[PDB]
Design a protein around this ligand. Structure first.
Ligand code: DMA
Ligand code: DMA
Ligand code: MG
Ligand code: MG
Ligand code: MG
Ligand code: MG
Ligand code: ZN
Ligand code: ZN
Lengths: 402, 402
RNA sequence: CUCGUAUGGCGCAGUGGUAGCGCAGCAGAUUGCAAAUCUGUUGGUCCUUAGUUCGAUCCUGAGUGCGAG
RNA sequence: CUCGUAUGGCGCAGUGGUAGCGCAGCAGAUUGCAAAUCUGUUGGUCCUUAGUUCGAUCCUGAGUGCGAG
């Protein structure tokens, strides 16, 4: 009965705090899921409650990757899948905690294997793959497997390129692979959503940036700018590694109310990450695991012990005890959060493309709407209204000539 | 990949009526589950849509059994599995329905493989298995694997006996087998719960019995008593076959007011089945498939086309189209029906046994409560109150003699 | 006119001293029998009355409801 | 009292004919980069008021808040 407990949510609710209670209380090792904490030390700014608070619970896939390195999906795909191994073969229950919920796709069938195949990537194929022009690599995909071709935009470099590579290396179009995909989840899992109202969670996430300088956010980033030298690397790769952490790039140009230049920006970047996190849980995660998840009202921190702690244990208990849970799944307060309307409903289903002939971006290309709902939006945007007006307006230069 | 569309619900909405609407628009075979439709003709009373409005839709597992045969959970566990095969390899899709929701338990990993190891039980083992006394075969189980032993009552013949046979034939205790059981479901499934209010569904189920005589319920049962005469199946083989169908035993005295004797009884038996059906879906099915099911308000039959038909297609559609459904999963009206409280909550979790020393049934044995909740109930039942009262009295006289 | 019977929603057992069984109902169970099987439990205080009595559902008479020649 | 000056949520441009830019904010995508990357979009009656001009956000008269001796 390979069971696995997963804690999802925005930072500022107590995930790395609950993962501790649900650790010894049920014998488990906590795995990480932050495309930041994996980088050697440099805590505080990268968030990670002091070691003397992990209650001796062996964490995995975190604090080990070197600054002058890059962390990708695959990396976690194996490093995580691996930690689960050890934790399992040790009668201990894994507890995956993390903000990059994209990585949660590993805990269940959703990845495309691309290594066991030796499809000789002929020169002609690579030239198309490693092409400088985005539309030429797209049209190629449009031909072979036009299905998946529509699910993406002709400007989605990373995406279109990824799909074609799959068609080439595996031979079998990626459209079919998905049409007959397991989608099931490995190891019986228990998803816990430790959510918190936006307004408060925001006020907290900001006072968290303030009191973040006191703990030594200064030295943190300062010790970060130090590694910046003795190596040198222009923004050609100095914006994809530890560099992303909130506080580095903010004081980067401020080191070649001037304080606000970095303060307000930091507090902003934080919220953005949060907002997206929620979006991914609501539009991706939840819908995929078919609304099977348990919310935890973390809005009021003065009731966390009863609204998130106590509640968590109970739920987590029956989960491990192989006994069906009796918990309502979500407090009446945060009830709509799981409703199809606040989740799956926000998804996209109409992929039919649309092209506006009277509008185009800087790249010269005409605008490309995807979906009736959105195609109709463009046709109503000031943009379209203006181009359409000065169009029929530049035409009125004929009446005054004929 | 291979998908299936089950249709649960009592017998007073249109499960068979809708199983057709979908089986066509989405191309599929309607696998039956009702343990009554699986008998040569005799439909007018065993209920099963006539070929008239059949619209040439293929129906499996039904009408293939003869009056003289005892159908069980295995013959279905095989026939169904086979029927689905054909459908899956014929460019179609299984549209399973049925009334005996128990059998649907086969649509996933649950049962044990007590076939591979056809090990022969030593005389000593069989003697214990095929014992006449229920407590002696139970104590045996209490010893080897006391875990599963508590999940049952010392009077649960069929149950306790079945568990022991699993321990013997497989060697591995049934307690562990369940503690590490898949529980997952084979083939992506879509459960549709075509429910309807109790009051109305009852009024309908009864006018159903009335107009049931007109279609020829008389000849139906009459042609049933005819098969009775041959070999004249004594009350030995009268509860293991078509015999149990409504009308048979009901009108047995009408062939050895006198009309109500069978009328009221019939209408009653009907409701009983319905009530239990709902309970199984609410306490068993739903909880198991983790509240993943779609209700369909069939209370008002004047809105069926919109509340059950239209709605069903839509949901069914995205299901097959491999697109996550956007349907609210259950109309605000019938909302509590899926709530943990109206389902999983009704389950039993405290299995600790309890014995009353002042109470015993006809079998002589003392009462055996299972679970605090219920142990406390017994301690307050009139039964206990009386035995406890007439006890202190016929025991206080001794306290008087001296 | 002759005679028994006249108890939980219905069909029944039963004792001078304060009551039961099955059906139904409610409820739990269900990992080859599930329209089966198992388990628990809510309803009467014995048609009405006056007496017979230390006290009657069970005793006597009667008003009354059914069963018969 | 004499001069600067107020343009969408924040900061800035800008033209005689009825407006932009960066940043926020909102929305969609995501099956080896995801704190990435891609795509779409809502905000102002250009301070108030009165005039020359056919036209006023940009010219002129004061009007009001803000800043300057
Ligand atoms: O710890 P905390 O409240 O920041 O939450 P998390 O660990 O999820 O960032
Ligand atoms: O009778 P009915 O067809 O309306 O109900 P069911 O189809 O469930 O037997
Ligand atoms: Mg933390
Ligand atoms: Mg007396
Ligand atoms: Mg003044
Ligand atoms: Mg922006
Ligand atoms: Zn346009
Ligand atoms: Zn008792």
């Amino acid at each position: 009965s390979k069971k696995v407990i997963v804690i999802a949510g925005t930072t500022g609710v107590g995930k790395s705090q609950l993962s501790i209670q649900l650790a010894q209380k049920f014998n488990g090792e906590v795995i990480n899921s932050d495309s930041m904490q994996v980088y050697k030390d440099i805590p505080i700014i990268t968030n990670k409650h002091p070691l003397q608070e992990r209650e001796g619970i062996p964490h995995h896939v975190m604090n080990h990757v070197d600054w002058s390195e890059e962390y990708y999906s695959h990396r976690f795909e194996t490093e995580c899948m691996n930690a689960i191994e050890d934790i399992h073969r040790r009668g201990k229950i894994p507890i995956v905690v993390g903000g990059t919920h994209y990585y949660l796709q590993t805990l269940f069938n959703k990845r495309v294997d691309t290594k066991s195949s030796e499809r000789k990537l002929t020169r002609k194929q690579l030239d198309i793959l490693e092409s400088t022009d985005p539309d030429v690599i797209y049209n190629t995909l449009v031909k072979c497997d036009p299905d998946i071709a529509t699910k993406y935009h002709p400007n989605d470099y990373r995406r279109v390129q990824r799909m074609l590579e799959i068609y080439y290396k595996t031979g079998k179009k990626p459209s079919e692979t998905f049409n007959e995909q397991k989608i099931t989840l490995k190891f019986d899992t228990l998803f816990l959503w430790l959510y918190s109202k936006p307004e408060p969670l925001f006020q907290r996430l900001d006072d968290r940036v303030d009191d973040m300088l006191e703990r030594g956010a200064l030295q943190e980033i300062k010790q970060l700018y130090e590694y910046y030298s003795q190596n040198k690397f222009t923004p050609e790769q100095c914006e994809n590694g530890v560099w992303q952490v909130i506080g580095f790039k903010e004081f980067l140009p401020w080191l070649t109310v001037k304080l606000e230049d970095c303060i307000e920006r930091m507090k902003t970047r934080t919220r953005q990450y949060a907002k997206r996190q929620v979006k991914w849980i609501k539009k991706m995660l939840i819908p995929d695991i078919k609304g099977d998840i348990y919310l935890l009202d973390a809005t009021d921190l003065s009731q966390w012990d009863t609204n998130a702690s106590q509640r968590a244990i109970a739920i987590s208990n029956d989960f491990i005890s192989n006994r069906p849970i009796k918990q309502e799944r979500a407090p009446k307060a945060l009830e709509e959060l799981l409703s199809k309307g606040e989740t799956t409903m926000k998804k996209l289903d109409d992929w039919t493309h649309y092209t506006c002939n009277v509008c185009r971006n800087a790249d010269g290309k005409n605008v490309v709407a995807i979906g009736e709902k959105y195609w109709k939006i463009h046709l109503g945007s000031r943009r379209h209204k203006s181009n359409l007006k000065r169009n029929t307006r530049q035409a009125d230069f004929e009446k005054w000539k004929i």
